[PDB]
Amino acid sequence: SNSGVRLDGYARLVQQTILCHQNPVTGLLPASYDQKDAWVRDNVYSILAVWGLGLAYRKNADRDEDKAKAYELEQSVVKLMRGLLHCMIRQVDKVESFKYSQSTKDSLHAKYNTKTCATVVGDDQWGHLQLDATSVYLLFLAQMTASGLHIIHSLDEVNFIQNLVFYIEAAYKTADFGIWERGDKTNQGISELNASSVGMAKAALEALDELDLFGVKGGPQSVIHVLADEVQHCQSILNSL
Amino acid sequence: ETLWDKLDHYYRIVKSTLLLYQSPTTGLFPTKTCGGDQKAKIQDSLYCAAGAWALALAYRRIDDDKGRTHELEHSAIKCMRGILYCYMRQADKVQQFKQDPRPTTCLHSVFNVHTGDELLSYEEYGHLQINAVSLYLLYLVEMISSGLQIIYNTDEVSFIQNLVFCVERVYRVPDFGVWERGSKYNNGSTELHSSSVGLAKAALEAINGFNLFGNQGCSWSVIFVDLDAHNRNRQTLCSLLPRESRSHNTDAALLPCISYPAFALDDEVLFSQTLDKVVRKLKGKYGFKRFLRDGYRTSLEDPNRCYYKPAEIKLFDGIECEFPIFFLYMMIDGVFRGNPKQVQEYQDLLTPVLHHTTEGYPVVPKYYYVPADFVEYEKNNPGSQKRFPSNCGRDGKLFLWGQALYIIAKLLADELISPKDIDPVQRYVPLKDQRNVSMRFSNQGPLENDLVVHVALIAESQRLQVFLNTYGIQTQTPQQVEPIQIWPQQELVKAYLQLGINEKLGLSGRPDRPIGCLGTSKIYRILGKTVVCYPIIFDLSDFYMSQDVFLLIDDIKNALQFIKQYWKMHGRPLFLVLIREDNIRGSRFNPILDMLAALKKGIIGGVKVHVDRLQTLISGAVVEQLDFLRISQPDVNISEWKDKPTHEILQKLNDCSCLASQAILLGILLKREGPNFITKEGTVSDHIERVYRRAGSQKLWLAVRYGAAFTQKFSSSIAPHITTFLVHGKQVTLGAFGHEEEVISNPLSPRVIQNIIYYKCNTHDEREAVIQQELVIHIGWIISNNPELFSGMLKIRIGWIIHAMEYELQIRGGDKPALDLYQLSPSEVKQLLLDILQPQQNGRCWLNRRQIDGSLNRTPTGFYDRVWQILERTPNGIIVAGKHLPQQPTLSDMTMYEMNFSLLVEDTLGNIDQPQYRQIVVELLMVVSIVLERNPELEFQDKVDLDRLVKEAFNEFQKDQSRLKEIEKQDDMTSFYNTPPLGKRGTCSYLTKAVMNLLLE
Amino acid sequence: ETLWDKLDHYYRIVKSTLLLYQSPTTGLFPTKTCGGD
């Protein structure tokens, strides 16, 4: 059929463009070019294509080969998201320090490394403040949890996610470098509030209101609890600016 | 000695006994090995083929078999192909039986062996037998699962599907039985048999979800099954399991159905009880008899009367033949159950009776008979004398079925094979593996029931959705589930109807039948689109009880209980519920909140439920696939307005607003002019439908009932109720009180029953049709959920029950005029019926209680046996209401527990006009029975006149009342009715005094 | 006592002895339960 031919062509294009540099074990694709680093934002945004391909392939599979292909795509995106979660969970001290007071020194690094998931730069050689990346990551994680892709295994990860919720819950009064990593309009960056980060964080906070991470087979303690005042404050700030 | 000698000896035995007389033209064995008989059965050839297949399976274990296995596989395949060709030769009969089953349209079971054509007319053999087809299907699926190939092309798949469709409805049509005689009297009547139902159920389990092409198959080798038919077969088997038939207390034919061929009794305790009863009641020195009082080819039997005369069965007892073939079945059961002692004891018992050929080959004679010089001596001493071998025990005549069973039993005993090899499908499992099987036991274990059922909530309108949300109720509109589609029940029925159509032969597919709740509980995929349906309770119904929310609460609760009890599929069932905006209707909006809040709580009367978004439940669940489609008060009186002209009636209809007058005018117009007349609002039928729907919307019950009677609509569930009433043992009679009544003793087609009831309705009254329908549905529901309530009643009559609750309501009204029952709500009608059905207590007048008991035709427990013992000890007989019950015919025809004696007693007792008089007579009979049983010295000198005894008791009561209360002689015995039977001076004392007066004289 | 009590007791002992010392980073148990090996 024509639909099968189009799906095969799209799968070939995706394989030749994205999947060539998946970097297994770690599961993080390089952030293009010969820089040898893994930016969180681009790595999260580089997944919607394969996720949509798998979602479209699942509903019309009805065959061993197509079901296997959908299995492979879903397990690949699960691998990538687990790789994302590992690097963040390796830095619990940083988020614990950031939970009290706000400072640039106690913030998570924005550019993680390749295999062994180490640090590449110090705390005084890059702007390590990007709430938008964490917000969009949490929002998309909630979305794929809703679709039915298991991403969470251990209960301690639920506690880490709850801590990160408080880590990003103060985005309406916290200044950041920005999406472009250049501070304000000019150079010599000074932290300044931007509406994009607040809009990114508001939907992420709204998404995880009741969505359990254990699927339909969860328990009494399987959901993330969020407030509502912060959402209203973010909405008011966005409307004002 | 190695295995070679034993296998060679078995080969010689088979060649000299079994395969010698095989017909090369057709591959099917005949019934007679001498005289050139041209008749053949189906059971013997199939059993011989199974024995050959088992021998070949045993011989397969040698890599140097020299082609011995190949010949046996080829012979079995040829026999199966010949039987399939013979079955498919007759095609019109299958199509006819699929629509109107009857002995005329029955599939032929006996035909000539030389050309595979019919030889004897159906008027001399019946040809109605369904056990053979079920056993053939089971053996065919067993052989295919073994690894053999029998099906050639796709037309055979369609033929198998049509055979399954035709056999699905075996739970209603009576059969001729395994022995072809059926009733013990042998008069030409068909009755239900439990063995046939068990075999059909086993085949239905076996054929479900199986690839018919063997190793390879994608979508053209599967068979689809309906769960409702399997459930009904299971219920019928369970109800009719203790007794094989109403006329047979026990029979030897119950053995191959609770044994290796079937393995269908998974109850342990009841299976053991039945086995012990059969062994105790049918054990014999030379084998197992067919059944008691069986005059089958005995010495007194003569070949001049096909049907036995009455009272001949009494003379035929004591000379029953012996069949040693059942010893092999018992030995097979013993080895299957791992009880060596039983195997040894039956082998030692079978050793002396066995015969030998000229070469010493074993012989199993068919039956044993007694010479004519020991006819009377054997009666005095059972089994002390010796019998004589039959003709097929010396030379020239054999028994292929018996020899095949003997060799199978010997092969099983010699440990040459294993029980797993002979049962590749795992028909029999032990107690420790009944944990995660399909269609038999649940994952929770046999003695556990804690199933959790999923429930999905779907709204109907956005306004209703937001109204529910304002109160905290969460429902989703149908427009927000765009990927998911919700279809009614008719679409699935149409899709099933489209299946199973063949043009080469002519196939109509699955008949248009409604789908049960279990079938709709699944999720289907049609043309790549998921299809979900809701139970038929939610769809709009023209009837009136669907507008009562209490009835809906009760029926959804009953459906939930049914789903909980009879769900065995893997995965949780799916339940869909819809709420309509017209349902609340203002003040009737609170109890809906109550039920929905209870549903949200999690528990509904001890049944656990789950509620969530439909899309979440759909994802991660198994979806059924249907891939065949792509391949393929009134101011008008009747008397006053009867003679009015047509134009006046039309004007009155046009300018009147009352519903009752409009309905009566429409009825007069229909009766006089006809349904094709044209009125101001279109055709007569359209106007009647419109006014009926308007009455239903306004819910005024009398007008709705009148319109329903006009529309001639009937419920599609009367047949299950009548069939379960018949299988229970009770009887139902349709008619009106004080008028003609029709009695039903066997299941009938819906057309005949509909015609009879509609003719009766046209004869006597107007709305009794809908009242009778509501009464029968309520009674069936109550007996299904509370079977113990209807204990003591045999003949169920709707009209008498109607008169009963009418009398009770009139009594309750008292000074207030009695309310009309046509205007009663369904909840009030149900409450009244449940109140009258109650076992009744004191406080109220005993005359009313006796009237209610007599109207219900209630009988005391043990009344039938007491009557039988009285009749045994009554030399003359009992005469009542002018009817006579001679002792000699009832003693020489019937037995202790036979149902026809009870039927005759009920017919004799049904001539009593006053139900209270009948109750008093029954109590007097019980008193007489107890008194006579307690003392054997006193015996009756002549026939007793119970009317005389009742008159004497009434006169004695009159004298006592005159002595005590100074009451003069008053006519009628209603004063006797008012007095309770027990107390200071009860009726029992007067009955005992009359009894002693009769005994003394 | 139903199976729930025994299963709950097994859950408590497993939580108190086995799953208590699981490492969230790698999911591998250590060879010593004390001293921070």
UniProtKB/Swiss-Prot annotation, chain A:
Using the record for this protein, list the coiled-coil segments as residue ranges, or answer none: none
Report what the Swiss-Prot or TrEMBL entry states about this protein's PTMs: Although the final Cys may be farnesylated, the terminal tripeptide is probably not removed, and the C-terminus is not methylated.
Q: Please give the tissue specificity annotation from the record for this chain.
A: Muscle specific. Isoform 1 is predominant in vastus lateralis muscle. Isoform 2 predominates slightly in heart, and it predominates clearly in the other tissues tested.
Q: Where in the cell is it found?
A: Cell membrane
What does the similarity note say?
Belongs to the phosphorylase b kinase regulatory chain family.
Q: Linked disorder?
A: Glycogen storage disease 9D: A metabolic disorder characterized by slowly progressive, predominantly distal muscle weakness and atrophy. Clinical features include exercise intolerance with early fatigability, pain, cramps and occasionally myoglobinuria.
Q: What is this protein's function per UniProt?
A: Phosphorylase b kinase catalyzes the phosphorylation of serine in certain substrates, including troponin I. The alpha chain may bind calmodulin.
**How does the annotation summarize its subunit structure?**
Hexadecamer of 4 heterotetramers, each composed of alpha, beta, gamma, and delta subunits. Alpha (PHKA1 or PHKA2) and beta (PHKB) are regulatory subunits, gamma (PHKG1 or PHKG2) is the catalytic subunit, and delta is calmodulin.
Q: What is this protein called?
A: Phosphorylase b kinase regulatory subunit alpha, skeletal muscle isoform
Curated annotation (Swiss-Prot), chain C:
Q: Which cell locations does it reside in? A: Cell membrane
* UniProt modification remark: Although the final Cys may be farnesylated, the terminal tripeptide is probably not removed, and the C-terminus is not methylated.
- Its transmembrane ranges are none
Disulfide partners: none
Q: Which disease is it linked to?
A: Glycogen storage disease 9B: A metabolic disorder characterized by hepatomegaly, only slightly elevated transaminases and plasma lipids, clinical improvement with increasing age, and remarkably no clinical muscle involvement. Biochemical observations suggest that this mild phenotype is caused by an incomplete holoenzyme that lacks the beta subunit, but that may possess residual activity.
Q: Which family does it belong to?
A: Belongs to the phosphorylase b kinase regulatory chain family.
Q: How does it assemble?
A: Hexadecamer of 4 heterotetramers, each composed of alpha, beta, gamma, and delta subunits. Alpha (PHKA1 or PHKA2) and beta (PHKB) are regulatory subunits, gamma (PHKG1 or PHKG2) is the catalytic subunit, and delta is calmodulin.
Q: What does this protein do?
A: Phosphorylase b kinase catalyzes the phosphorylation of serine in certain substrates, including troponin I. The beta chain acts as a regulatory unit and modulates the activity of the holoenzyme in response to phosphorylation.
Instruction: Identify this protein by name.
Output: Phosphorylase b kinase regulatory subunit beta
Q: What high-level taxonomic lineage is stated for the organism? A: Eukaryota, Metazoa, Chordata, Craniata, Vertebrata
Residues of the whole record sequence present: 43 to 79 of 1093
